[PDB]
């Protein structure tokens, strides 16, 4: 029995699809082997989403690994509802409870309130943007409605003087203390211009929001005198992660994009962790003598009224069931297809 | 012309947690001079005691760093006691 | 003879009732549009995909239609790629997206510039999820530069269940902060069911401040609400006065 | 215990009002006379100038034979001038 | 006050007004010595105006 499942990789997803490919031959049965059919595509157009995964399904796939961006996921989460089809990705959580989606990446709300509580923040600014969506905005509004915090939100996904501005009248309300929710690419506009105007001197707490902490390049405030302090998924000096860094940088650049350096983007170690539960979940499914293969052709997703295969509940739930051990930590999902059981470390920037 | 003893209370505790925001972390330290800053902004009937006296002593004797917020929420409610002397 | 779309949401009647005369009224005899309505739930983006692609090869010329916050993506992005004109009373998009004639003005200035005409420096905001969090991201930006302090409160998690309960609580806390100022965001619906439950509570007597940040205010019963003694204001986009309107109510309540 | 003067300005309104009530009619008449009553109930810093001295004016000022309710409620927010002198 | 003459048709106005002249009365207190049906008129109109 062979196994065919499509995947959607954005352009520029380089490293992420190499972790993709090395997860494919790390993570190989002899009995079954997972067949990928790749698509770039731009992910934040609807349009190109929509068309990528009916060509996907019309081709037959038991399962698709992919990406989404603020605009896309809707059409995601209600395409796969809708034909049963099974959807894997290191993407942000969806708020809500979505079927047939698997979200490899855990839930950060909680680690970074009760962060606020530990520094004991009654009072701080928060710079998000509309990328990864709204959620963590509506967590971090309500728990400062119900401890009476002063918070500040400010959207900086849409706008240089403007930043000079809002630091300034932070400096004179004399609020150090800043949450940075935003792209890789933001955070790092963001310090640039924090250290241009020099906001990034002492008195100053830093906290960015994401599991990529230790992943970008934190040289440049390391030297900054301000308190900075995030969040790792991925802990380096695990046995796993080790042995996976030691095959990793040492893999040659030419096939693998990416790959010789010493470290990895949570994102593409959760494409990794992603091959490892569809491994696991087709395992169990062929190990459970429950036979997949796929009864009549998929058709025309557009087909009215819909037609979902029925059998393809099952590898939902297979994959749900699923529970190991990968990079990010222990791996386990719940009913709504949400990380569950996840560890997140939490780092602080300093001198050393 | 018209001042209002409540209304110079409601002014005074406002300003000294307006400004103790200021000084987060450092607040413990700086609830008299803060307090200096709302008596002497929203005004008061003897200089000496202030806008109110007894939320000034009931702050400097609970604030704590970063527990600004629960501090002035449970002092604000105190008896101002004596304006005059 | 021209052939437009006519998409619908699952429970739109009165709208398409005003669709239907508005068919009768400017229909010449040049030419006649001829709608091709499809009723869907509007939520669902794989529905509005198919019935959106289902218009267009149909060979429709343009389509009306309304969008959710989720469907709306799905829409702009096909209309935009096919080149298939959208014409929609509903809500505004947060940036420039082409092929799509957008029938609903924007609110927002509105709104900041009431706030700042009764001179609000501390009330309460009530949002939910459906017309977006536009509104509130741009109330929440002027507010950190006027210094107003919103409480942003989200009412559209609120199960049709238990809502009466929670509406008492977070207005009890509400009472406690002493904020009387307060910012409905939200369909009519929310609004009857909040404003009920503000006269339950009798919120809604003297020197309590209501804004209904809907564009109707007078389309909703607010009747209930009116004695109180509580002030109450909001914005209208349809003036009853004009005797364009006025001739329309004659031929529509009739 | 702590006296707080804007507490004593709720107290005064409203034990004004509350004797006002006892005479009808002649209410503009007795106004002062309650008012003596409020003072001498809740409590002034000073006993010349009583619990809130700008009520006591605006109320005479204002109160009407039967007009007592809207007197009360449009005098009560005033401001109380002061406590000391 | 006997609530039992007022016109179904005029009642409204009819309670506003006389509620109103109950607040010039500074009436707080009151007692409803009504049928159950007429009680339930009553304090709808209670709460209309918020009292
Ligand atoms: C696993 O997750 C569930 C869900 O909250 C929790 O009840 C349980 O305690 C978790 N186990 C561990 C070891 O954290």
């Given at each position: 029995?062979?196994?065919?499942?499509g995947?959607?990789?954005?352009?520029?997803?380089?490293q992420?699809?190499?972790?993709?490919?090395?997860?494919?031959?790390?993570?190989?049965?002899s009995?079954?082997?997972?067949?990928?059919?790749?698509?770039n595509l731009?992910?934040?157009?609807?349009?190109?989403?929509?068309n990528?995964?009916?060509?996907?399904?019309?081709?037959?796939?038991?399962?698709?690994?992919?990406?989404?961006?603020?605009?896309?996921?809707?059409?995601?989460?209600?395409?796969?509802?809708?034909?049963?089809?099974?959807?894997?990705?290191?993407?942000?959580?969806?708020?809500?409870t979505?079927?047939?989606?698997?979200?490899?990446?855990?839930?950060?709300?909680?680690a970074?309130?009760?962060?606020?509580?530990?520094?004991?923040?009654?009072?701080?600014?928060?710079?998000?943007?509309?990328?990864?969506?709204?959620?963590?905005?509506?967590?971090?509004?309500?728990?400062?409605?119900?401890?009476?915090?002063?918070?500040?939100?400010?959207?900086?996904?849409?706008?240089?003087?403007?930043?000079?501005s809002?630091?300034?009248?932070?400096?004179?309300?004399?609020?150090?203390?800043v949450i940075l929710?935003?792209?890789?690419?933001?955070?790092?506009?963001?310090?640039?211009?924090?250290?241009?105007?020099?906001?990034?001197?002492?008195?100053?707490?830093?906290?960015?929001?994401n599991?990529?902490?230790?992943?970008?390049?934190?040289?440049?405030?390391?030297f900054?005198g301000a308190?900075?302090?995030?969040?790792?998924?991925?802990d380096?000096?695990?046995?796993?992660?080790?042995?996976?860094?030691?095959?990793?940088?040492?893999?040659?650049?030419?096939?693998?994009?990416?790959?010789?350096?010493?470290?990895?983007?949570?994102?593409?170690?959760?494409?990794?962790?992603?091959?490892?539960?569809?491994?696991?979940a087709?395992?169990?499914?062929?190990?459970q003598?429950?036979?997949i293969?796929?009864?009549?052709?998929?058709?025309?997703?557009?087909?009215?009224?819909?037609?979902?295969?029925?059998?393809?509940?099952?590898?939902?739930?297979?994959?749900?069931?699923?529970?190991?051990?990968?990079?990010?930590?222990?791996?386990?999902?719940?009913?709504?297809?949400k990380?569950?059981?996840?560890?997140?470390?939490?780092?602080?920037?300093?001198?050393? | 012309?018209?001042?209002?003893?409540?209304?110079?209370?409601?002014?005074?505790?406002?300003?000294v947690?307006?400004?103790?925001?200021?000084?987060?972390?450092?607040?413990?330290?700086?609830?008299?001079?803060?307090?200096?800053?709302?008596?002497?902004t929203?005004?008061?009937?003897?200089?000496?005691?202030?806008?109110?006296?007894?939320?000034?002593?009931?702050?400097i004797?609970?604030?704590?760093?970063?527990?600004?917020?629960?501090?002035?929420?449970?002092?604000?409610?105190?008896?101002?006691?004596?304006?005059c002397? | 003879?021209?052939?437009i779309g006519?998409?619908?949401?699952?429970?739109?009647?009165?709208?398409?009732?005003?669709?239907?005369?508005?068919?009768?009224?400017?229909?010449?005899?040049?030419?006649?549009?001829?709608?091709?309505?499809?009723?869907?739930?509007?939520?669902?983006?794989?529905?509005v995909?198919?019935?959106?692609?289902?218009?267009?090869?149909?060979?429709v010329?343009?389509?009306?239609?309304?969008?959710?916050?989720?469907?709306?993506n799905?829409?702009?992005?096909?209309?935009?790629?096919?080149?298939?004109?959208?014409?929609?009373?509903?809500?505004?998009?947060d940036?420039?997206?082409?092929?799509?004639?957008?029938?609903?003005?924007?609110?927002?200035?509105?709104?900041?510039?009431?706030?700042?005409?009764?001179?609000?420096?501390?009330?309460?905001?009530?949002?939910?999820?459906?017309?977006?969090?536009?509104?509130?991201?741009?109330?929440?930006?002027?507010?950190?530069?006027?210094?107003?302090?919103?409480?942003?409160?989200?009412?559209?998690?609120?199960?049709?269940?238990?809502?009466?309960?929670?509406?008492?609580?977070?207005?009890?806390?509400?009472?406690?902060?002493?904020?009387?100022?307060?910012?409905?965001?939200?369909?009519?619906?929310?609004?009857?069911?909040?404003?009920?439950?503000?006269?339950?509570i009798?919120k809604?007597?003297?020197?309590?401040?209501?804004?209904?940040?809907?564009?109707?205010?007078?389309?909703?019963?607010?009747?209930?609400?009116?004695?109180?003694?509580?002030?109450?204001?909001?914005?209208?986009?349809?003036?009853?006065?004009?005797?364009?309107?006025?001739?329309?109510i004659?031929?529509?309540?009739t």
């Amino acid at each position: 029995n062979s196994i065919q499942i499509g995947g959607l990789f954005p352009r520029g997803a380089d490293q992420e699809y190499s972790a993709f490919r090395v997860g494919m031959v790390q993570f190989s049965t002899s009995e079954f082997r997972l067949t990928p059919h790749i698509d770039n595509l731009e992910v934040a157009n609807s349009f190109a989403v929509t068309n990528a995964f009916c060509s996907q399904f019309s081709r037959g796939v038991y399962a698709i690994f992919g990406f989404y961006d603020k605009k896309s996921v809707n059409t995601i989460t209600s395409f796969c509802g809708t034909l049963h089809v099974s959807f894997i990705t290191p993407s942000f959580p969806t708020d809500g409870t979505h079927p047939f989606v698997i979200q490899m990446r855990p839930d950060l709300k909680g680690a970074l309130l009760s962060l606020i509580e530990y520094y004991q923040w009654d009072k701080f600014a928060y710079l998000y943007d509309s990328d990864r969506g709204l959620s963590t905005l509506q967590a971090v509004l309500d728990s400062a409605a119900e401890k009476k915090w002063q918070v500040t939100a400010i959207n900086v996904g849409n706008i240089d003087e403007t930043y000079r501005s809002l630091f300034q009248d932070l400096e004179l309300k004399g609020e150090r203390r800043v949450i940075l929710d935003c792209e890789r690419d933001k955070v790092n506009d963001i310090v640039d211009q924090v250290i241009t105007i020099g906001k990034h001197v002492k008195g100053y707490h830093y906290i960015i929001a994401n599991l990529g902490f230790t992943d970008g390049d934190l040289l440049k405030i390391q030297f900054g005198g301000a308190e900075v302090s995030g969040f790792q998924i991925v802990d380096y000096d695990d046995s796993l992660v080790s042995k996976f860094i030691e095959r990793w940088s040492t893999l040659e650049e030419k096939e693998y994009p990416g790959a010789h350096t010493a470290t990895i983007k949570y994102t593409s170690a959760l494409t990794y962790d992603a091959v490892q539960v569809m491994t696991e979940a087709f395992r169990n499914l062929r190990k459970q003598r429950i036979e997949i293969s796929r009864r009549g052709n998929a058709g025309d997703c557009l087909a009215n009224p819909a037609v979902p295969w029925g059998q393809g509940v099952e590898i939902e739930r297979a994959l749900k069931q699923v529970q190991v051990e990968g990079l990010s930590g222990n791996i386990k999902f719940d009913q709504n297809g949400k990380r569950i059981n996840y560890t997140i470390n939490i780092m602080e920037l300093k001198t050393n | 012309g018209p001042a209002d003893c409540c209304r110079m209370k409601e002014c005074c505790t406002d300003r000294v947690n307006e400004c103790l925001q200021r000084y987060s972390g450092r607040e413990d330290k700086f609830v008299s001079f803060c307090y200096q800053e709302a008596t002497v902004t929203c005004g008061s009937f003897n200089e000496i005691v202030g806008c109110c006296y007894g939320y000034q002593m009931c702050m400097i004797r609970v604030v704590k760093p970063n527990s600004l917020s629960g501090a002035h929420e449970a002092c604000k409610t105190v008896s101002c006691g004596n304006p005059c002397a | 003879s021209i052939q437009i779309g006519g998409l619908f949401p699952r429970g739109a009647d009165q709208e398409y009732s005003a669709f239907r005369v508005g068919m009768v009224q400017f229909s010449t005899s040049e030419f006649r549009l001829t709608p091709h309505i499809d009723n869907l739930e509007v939520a669902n983006s794989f529905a509005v995909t198919n019935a959106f692609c289902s218009q267009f090869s149909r060979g429709v010329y343009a389509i009306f239609g309304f969008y959710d916050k989720k469907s709306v993506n799905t829409i702009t992005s096909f209309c935009g790629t096919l080149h298939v004109s959208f014409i929609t009373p509903s809500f505004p998009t947060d940036g420039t997206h082409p092929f799509v004639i957008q029938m609903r003005p924007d609110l927002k200035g509105a709104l900041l510039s009431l706030i700042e005409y009764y001179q609000w420096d501390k009330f309460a905001y009530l949002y939910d999820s459906d017309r977006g969090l536009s509104t509130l991201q741009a109330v929440l930006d002027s507010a950190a530069e006027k210094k107003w302090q919103v409480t942003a409160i989200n009412v559209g998690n609120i199960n049709n269940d238990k809502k009466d309960e929670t509406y008492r609580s977070l207005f009890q806390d509400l009472e406690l902060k002493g904020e009387r100022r307060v910012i409905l965001d939200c369909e009519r619906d929310k609004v009857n069911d909040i404003v009920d439950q503000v006269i339950t509570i009798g919120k809604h007597v003297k020197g309590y401040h209501y804004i209904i940040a809907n564009l109707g205010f007078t389309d909703g019963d607010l009747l209930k609400i009116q004695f109180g003694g509580a002030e109450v204001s909001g914005f209208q986009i349809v003036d009853y006065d004009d005797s364009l309107v006025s001739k329309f109510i004659e031929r529509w309540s009739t």
